[PDB]
Amino acid sequence: SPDERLQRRIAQLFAEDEQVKAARPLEAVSAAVSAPGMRLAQIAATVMAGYADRPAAGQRAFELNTDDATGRTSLRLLPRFETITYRELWQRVGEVAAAWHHDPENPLRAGDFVALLGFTSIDYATLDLADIHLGAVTVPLQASAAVSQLIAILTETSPRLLASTPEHLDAAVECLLAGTTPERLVVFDYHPEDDDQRAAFESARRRLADAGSLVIVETLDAVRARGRDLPAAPLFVPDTDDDPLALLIYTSGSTGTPKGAMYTNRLAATMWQGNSMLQGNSQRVGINLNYMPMSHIAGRISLFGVLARGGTAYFAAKSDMSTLFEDIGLVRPTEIFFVPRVCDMVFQRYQSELDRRSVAGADLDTLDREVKADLRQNYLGGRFLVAVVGSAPLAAEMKTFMESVLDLPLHDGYGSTEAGASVLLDNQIQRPPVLDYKLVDVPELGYFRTDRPHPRGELLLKAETTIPGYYKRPEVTAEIFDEDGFYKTGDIVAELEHDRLVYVDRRNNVLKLSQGEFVTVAHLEAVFASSPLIRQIFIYGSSERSYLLAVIVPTDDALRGRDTATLKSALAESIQRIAKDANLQPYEIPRDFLIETEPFTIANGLLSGIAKLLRPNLKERYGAQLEQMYTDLAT
Numbered sequence: 001s002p003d004e005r006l007q008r009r010i011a012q013l014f015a016e017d018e019q020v021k022a023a024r025p026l027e028a029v030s031a032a033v034s035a036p037g038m039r040l041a042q043i044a045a046t047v048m049a050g051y052a053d054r055p056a057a058g059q060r061a062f063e064l065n066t067d068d069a070t071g072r073t074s075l076r077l078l079p080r081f082e083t084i085t086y087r088e089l090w091q092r093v094g095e096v097a098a099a100w101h102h103d104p105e106n107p108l109r110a111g112d113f114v115a116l117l118g119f120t121s122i123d124y125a126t127l128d129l130a131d132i133h134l135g136a137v138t139v140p141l142q143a144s145a146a147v148s149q150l151i152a153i154l155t156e157t158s159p160r161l162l163a164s165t166p167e168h169l170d171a172a173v174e175c176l177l178a179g180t181t182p183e184r185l186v187v188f189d190y191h192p193e194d195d196d197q198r199a200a201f202e203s204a205r206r207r208l209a210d211a212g213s214l215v216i217v218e219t220l221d222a223v224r225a226r227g228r229d230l231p232a233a234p235l236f237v238p239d240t241d242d243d244p245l246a247l248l249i250y251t252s253g254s255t256g257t258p259k260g261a262m263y264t265n266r267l268a269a270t271m272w273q274g275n276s277m278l279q280g281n282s283q284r285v286g287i288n289l290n291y292m293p294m295s296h297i298a299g300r301i302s303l304f305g306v307l308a309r310g311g312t313a314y315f316a317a318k319s320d321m322s323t324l325f326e327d328i329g330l331v332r333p334t335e336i337f338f339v340p341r342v343c344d345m346v347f348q349r350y351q352s353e354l355d356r357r358s359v360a361g362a363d364l365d366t367l368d369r370e371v372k373a374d375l376r377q378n379y380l381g382g383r384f385l386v387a388v389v390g391s392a393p394l395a396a397e398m399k400t401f402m403e404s405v406l407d408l409p410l411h412d413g414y415g416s417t418e419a420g421a422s423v424l425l426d427n428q429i430q431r432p433p434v435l436d437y438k439l440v441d442v443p444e445l446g447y448f449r450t451d452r453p454h455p456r457g458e459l460l461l462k463a464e465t466t467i468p469g470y471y472k473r474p475e476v477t478a479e480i481f482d483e484d485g486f487y488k489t490g491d492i493v494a495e496l497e498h499d500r501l502v503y504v505d506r507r508n509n510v511l512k513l514s515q516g517e518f519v520t521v522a523h524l525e526a527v528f529a530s531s532p533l534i535r536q537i538f539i540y541g542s543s544e545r546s547y548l549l550a551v552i553v554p555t556d557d558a559l560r561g562r563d564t565a566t567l568k569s570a571l572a573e574s575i576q577r578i579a580k581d582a583n584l585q586p587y588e589i590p591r592d593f594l595i596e597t598e599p600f601t602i603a604n605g606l607l608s609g610i611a612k613l614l615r616p617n618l619k620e621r622y623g624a625q626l627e628q629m630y631t632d633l634a635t
């Protein structure tokens with residue numbers, strides 16, 4: 001059977017693979033972690049002691065290369081990873097915490113805010129745990145946020161320390177020049193031998209000097225060396241009836257201004273011991289590649305859930321996924337969380353390889369099997385026990401495809417920053433943490449409890465993992481809870497039967513075409529991902545119009561040897577074939593579109609940090625062009 005075959009691979013792994021064998025969670029440690037009165041920092045401490053000698057975290061090895069022509073010295077990555085142990089990481093954490101707690105003039109205290117501007121890394125983990133160690137509130141800033149937004153965040157949270165990576169010092173210094181509250185700027189992920197990083201650092205210190213700031217600019221290495229000669233810091237443990245704030249996770253609802261979702265000491269502890277499948281509540285060996293930012297809930301769960309199981313968390317070299325598959329192939333994780341964008345990258349690799357190897361003497365469906373086998377064992381590392389997709393919808397055909405590549409199920413996990421990570425797993429309500437739910441009719445979008453095969457409406461939730469609200473935004477907080485205490489997800493679902501729900505789309509993505517047919521734009525975007533010719537797609541509509549438009553980023557091979565006209569016909573053809581396969585309505589098919597050779601990225605503000613389309617920014621970028629296309633066509 002399919003499970004039988006997969007279970008045969010795992011038995012081989014545990015017989016043969018000694019890294020895997022050595023990373024099995026310890027029952028005694030898991031027991032201690034799930035102990036009743038344990039608070040967040042005690043959990044961290046227990047894990048670190050319990051797994052002290054094991055590799056905890058890894059990063060790419062690197063070299064420093066001097067170009068004798070330019071004279072410039074740059075950090076260069078090597079194709080391997082280096083690890084540090086639980087003991088070493090915790091030692092580093094304790095050093096930062098001692099430095100902060102025992103500072104002679106201006107020490108940090110429980111409840112102070114600390115702001116962090118980074119990706120995900122050993123240094124990030126060090127700073128984040130040190131906050132936890134002292135009961136400081138972590139504010140992990142989104143790299144994708146505009147400086148104006150960052151300043152808004154800092155104004156609101158009044159942190160006493162700001163920490164930043166070199167690539168982010170430009171935004172960090174503008175925040176500090178603006179008269180915000182941090183007293184120290186701590187640079188991390190910092191290699192002074194790299195000229196570009198050194199220049200960013202020395203610029204940062206000299207601009208703050210020139211401007212007469214009293215901010216102390218320093219390196220994380222220097223903070224650690226200082227704490228190394230200071231007494232041990234106390235471990236923060238709130239009293240039994242207290243649940244102080246521990247973490248703010250900023251998230252942008254249906255339009256991009258950040259609101260800080262409040263995670264209390266208790267809610268943050270669920271990332272170590274809550275029951276998702278990627279949370280630390282299991283005995284699965286956790287060797288994983290962390291490629292999502294610590295500013296997002298999925299990044300934090302990926303780190304803390306792995307640490308909770310005594311596994312090893314490897315950090316991706318880059319935040320834009322440009323090293324993602326090289327990293328996965330080197331790490332060979334025993335688990336992944338996919339976002340759909342990553343499934344896209346796998347599909348594009350497949351299409352490319354298949355097209356390339358499809359020579360005259362080929363047997364094609366045996367070739368398909370061979371390309372997928374190569375993807376599986378080599379591109380993705382061949383050590384997977386489990387796979388999950390989440391954060392955004394995956395179309396049925398791409399799910400079918402990915403399962404064919406992985407040769408195991410691809411679990412669909414639905415959750416949110418506000419509601420919690422688990423909520424729905426493969427269409428099944430997860431209890432715990434869900435306490436109850438209901439569907440509420442949405443008459444103006446055509447979703448009623450009395451709809452056709454299955455009831456439809458907005459999902460409203462109660463769960464143990466729901467946030468209490470957003471930090472200092474109580475009128476915004478008021479709107480996400482109904483009179484009875486239900487969290488309004490803003491998501492449309494269908495109820496197949498009790499506790500079994502199918503995600504449709506966000507309420508705000510449901511559009512009524514003029515003839516009165518509703519379309520779901522994010523869902524249709526997912527469907528057209530299966531076009532072998534489409535690299536990215538943004539689908540756009542107007543309720544004043546009868547049909548959809550799109551902005552399509554073609555693949556490199558789709559582009560090759562074609563002019564604009566030919567490229568459009570080829571895309572249009574592919575679009576029709578995909579629509580047929582997914583049994584789409586005629587009105588669900590983009591009837592024209594813009595060709596865009598510039599990919600949507602984090603850097604140009606069109607992708608989020610977890611590679612989701614940022615709809616408000618895409619509407620602002622292409623909306624005028626698109627409406628003009630509507631007008632030209634109507635003419």
Ligand SMILES: Nc1ncnc2c1ncn2[C@@H]1O[C@H](COP(=O)(O)O)[C@@H](O)[C@H]1O
Pocket residue numbers: 251297389390391392393394412413414415416417418489490491503505506
């Ligand atoms: N498995 C999934 N399928 C479809 N959409 C999802 C899934 N998981 C999360 N989402 C979407 O992501 C939103 C939460 O985003 P975030 O707070 O960034 O995790 C949800 O309200 C959904 O719109």
